[PDB]
Amino acid sequence: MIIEGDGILDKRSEDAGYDLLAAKEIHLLPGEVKVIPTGVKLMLPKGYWGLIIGKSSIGSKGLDVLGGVIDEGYRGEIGVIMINVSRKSITLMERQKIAQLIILPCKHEVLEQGK
Amino acid sequence: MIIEGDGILDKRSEDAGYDLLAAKEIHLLPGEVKVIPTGVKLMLPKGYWGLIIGKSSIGSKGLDVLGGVIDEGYRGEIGVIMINVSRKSITLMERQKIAQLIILPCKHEVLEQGKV
Amino acid sequence: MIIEGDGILDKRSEDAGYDLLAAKEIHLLPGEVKVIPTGVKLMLPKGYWGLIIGKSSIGSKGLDVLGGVIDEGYRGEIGVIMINVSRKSITLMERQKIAQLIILPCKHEVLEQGKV
Ligand SMILES: O=c1ccn([C@H]2CC(O)[C@@H](COP(=O)(O)OP(=O)(O)OP(=O)(O)O)O2)c(=O)[nH]1
Ligand SMILES: O=c1ccn([C@H]2CC(O)[C@@H](COP(=O)(O)OP(=O)(O)OP(=O)(O)O)O2)c(=O)[nH]1
C-alpha cells in the first residue's frame, strides 16, 4: 500500500491493524476533544476503507478515540479524533502510538426507493 | 439495495458509507444517551450487515455512536444510539447528518468447544 | 470456530455477531477504567479478526466500552475494556451481556513510501 509520512508502522500478518503515531506532542485538558495529526497520507486499495479504532494501551488511560472512517478516495492526512474523558490533563508524546488503522472491504450498492 | 425513507443519502464509489440524517431535532445534555431516528428502513443484501459509525464533524464535538450494528435480519427503523461524552449540551438539527452506515460482509461460524 | 469458555453464545445466521457475557462480577468505581473479563479464548479463522462492539444498554448505564480489536494471532482470554463515566459505582454482574463480537476480513500489505 502507498503512503506518505512516517507516522504509521508496518504490521505482522497476524495483526489486524497498523499502528498510527502522533505527529507532535499533544496536551488534552479534561474533557477536551482533539483531532490528533499523524502526518500520514494514504492510498487505500480500490474497494477498501480504513477503520480508525483505539489501542487498549491508551484507552486504559481514559482516552476515547472516536471511531474514524477513512474513505477510499480521501487523499489528505489521517487525523485521530480523541477525547479525554478523565478528570485530569493528559500528554501524548511525539511519535507515541495513539491508534490503529484497519483495512476493511467496502461494498458499493446504489439505493432504490422500494418497500 | 432497497431502502425506504429519505434520512440516508446515496454515496460515491470513492465513499465508504452512506450518510444518515437526523429525522428530528435532538438535544443531548452532557453524558446523556438518546437514540436518534433516521426514518430509514432498508434491506441488507445477503451476506452483509450494516455498521453505523459517526462522521468526523459530529465526532469532533464529543458525540459518539454506541452499538451501531444493523443486522442482516432487521427491517425496523434505523436509530442512532448517540452519547454526548463532552462536558456541555449540544443540539443536532433536523436533517442534519449524524452518522454513516458502512455495509460490511457477514462471516458465520459455528462455535465448537475445544482446546485453543 | 474453536472457542474455549462460557462467555460466548452462538448466533442466528441473520445476526452479525456473538454475544459476550461478563466472566465475574465487576466493581467500577467512578472514573475507573476496567478490563471486563469474558473467560473465552478464540481461534479466529485465518485472515479474519474480531471486532468488539459494546452493548448499547451498558453505555447508557454510564459506561464507555473502548477499543475492541482481537487480532488473528491473539490466543488469550477476551477482555472488554470500559470506563466509568458517572458519579456512582456501577457493578456488572456475572453472565451479563456486555458486548458483541463480529468476525471481519482483514487486509495485509507492506507499507510503501510513494506519492498520493
Ligand atoms: O476519524 C476520522 C474521520 C475522518 N477523517 C477524514 C478522512 C476521511 O475519509 C475524510 C472525511 O470524513 P467525513 O466526510 O466523515 O466527516 P464530515 O466532516 O462529517 O464530512 P461531510 O459533511 O463533508 O461528509 O475525513 C479522519 O482523518 N479521521
Ligand atoms: O478490547 C480489547 C482490545 C484488545 N484485547 C487484546 C487482544 C488482542 O489482539 C491484544 C492486543 O491489544 P493491543 O495490541 O491493541 O494494545 P496495546 O497494549 O496498546 O499493544 P502494542 O503496541 O504492543 O500492540 O489485546 C482485548 O482482549 N480486548
Side-chain angles (χ1 to χ4, degrees):
Chain A
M1 172 167 81
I2 297 303
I3 65 164
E4 210 171 300
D6 57 305
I8 182 167
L9 300 173
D10 266 300
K11 74 174 192 67
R12 309 168 170 295
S13 293
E14 311 74 51
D15 297 343
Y18 304 87
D19 287 334
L20 265 44
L21 267 42
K24 58 178 195 296
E25 185 168 298
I26 302 290
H27 299 278
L28 293 186
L29 293 160
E32 202 182 16
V33 179
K34 259 197 177 59
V35 181
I36 300 166
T38 63
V40 317
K41 289 185 168 61
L42 292 175
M43 190 107 99
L44 292 177
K46 293 149 62 185
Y48 296 76
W49 65 288
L51 166 62
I52 295 175
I53 195 176
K55 290 186 73 61
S56 65
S57 180
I58 86 171
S60 50
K61 303 180 187 303
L63 284 183
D64 196 7
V65 165
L66 312 180
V69 184
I70 304 304
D71 293 295
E72 182 201 310
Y74 180 74
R75 253 56 175 190
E77 67 170 291
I78 291 108
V80 181
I81 298 167
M82 197 177 285
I83 296 178
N84 176 24
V85 302
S86 74
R87 323 296 184 183
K88 69 169 299 279
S89 293
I90 298 176
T91 300
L92 288 184
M93 295 173 290
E94 205 181 329
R95 302 194 70 68
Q96 155 160 26
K97 303 184 174 194
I98 60 173
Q100 281 180 292
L101 183 82
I102 305 160
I103 308 191
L104 291 135
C106 205
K107 194 192 199 292
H108 185 232
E109 268 203 3
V110 173
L111 277 34
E112 301 203 320
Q113 210 69 53
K115 179 66 205 300
Chain B
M1 169 169 55
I2 297 300
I3 66 171
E4 190 184 305
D6 67 328
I8 173 182
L9 311 179
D10 219 310
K11 84 179 178 84
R12 286 167 295 171
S13 205
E14 311 76 58
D15 298 349
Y18 310 75
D19 288 351
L20 293 171
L21 296 36
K24 69 196 296 174
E25 180 162 306
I26 317 299
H27 182 73
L28 310 159
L29 288 159
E32 191 175 62
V33 191
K34 287 199 177 183
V35 180
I36 306 180
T38 60
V40 53
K41 293 159 70 184
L42 54 114
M43 278 184 68
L44 297 171
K46 187 175 180 178
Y48 300 85
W49 57 286
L51 178 67
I52 303 303
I53 286 202
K55 304 199 56 54
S56 79
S57 62
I58 58 153
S60 66
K61 286 185 181 57
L63 273 270
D64 191 22
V65 177
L66 310 178
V69 173
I70 291 303
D71 292 288
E72 179 172 296
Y74 174 75
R75 308 303 196 201
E77 175 182 357
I78 294 193
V80 183
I81 316 295
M82 293 266 273
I83 183 162
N84 182 12
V85 307
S86 87
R87 291 279 219 282
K88 103 287 179 55
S89 68
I90 192 57
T91 291
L92 301 171
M93 298 190 306
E94 197 167 308
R95 294 207 72 67
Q96 189 197 292
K97 294 181 183 174
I98 62 172
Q100 316 174 55
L101 186 177
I102 299 165
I103 296 166
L104 292 171
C106 259
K107 170 64 176 187
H108 195 306
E109 282 256 5
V110 176
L111 271 22
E112 297 168 43
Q113 195 75 208
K115 192 65 186 178
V116 174
Chain C
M1 68 179 114
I2 302 320
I3 64 180
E4 190 180 296
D6 269 310
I8 190 170
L9 324 164
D10 271 294
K11 71 187 185 60
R12 318 284 287 193
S13 65
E14 43 262 293
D15 288 348
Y18 315 84
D19 299 353
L20 296 176
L21 312 180
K24 68 172 184 179
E25 179 172 297
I26 301 183
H27 285 43
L28 278 84
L29 289 295
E32 211 202 7
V33 188
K34 282 209 159 186
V35 175
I36 313 312
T38 66
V40 346
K41 285 186 168 67
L42 293 167
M43 196 161 281
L44 293 170
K46 316 150 167 289
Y48 294 74
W49 60 287
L51 168 64
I52 309 295
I53 285 168
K55 228 53 163 62
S56 73
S57 57
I58 80 267
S60 290
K61 291 184 170 57
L63 294 165
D64 184 43
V65 171
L66 313 180
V69 181
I70 310 301
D71 295 301
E72 172 190 288
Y74 184 66
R75 211 139 302 281
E77 173 202 51
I78 291 156
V80 186
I81 313 179
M82 307 188 318
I83 309 174
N84 188 314
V85 302
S86 75
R87 307 297 203 311
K88 62 177 296 290
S89 297
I90 299 189
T91 292
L92 285 182
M93 294 165 288
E94 284 190 42
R95 318 220 90 248
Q96 185 180 320
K97 290 188 174 179
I98 63 178
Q100 240 179 302
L101 172 78
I102 299 166
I103 292 65
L104 292 160
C106 172
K107 193 69 185 299
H108 178 264
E109 306 196 5
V110 170
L111 265 27
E112 286 173 49
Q113 189 101 181
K115 195 65 175 175
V116 309

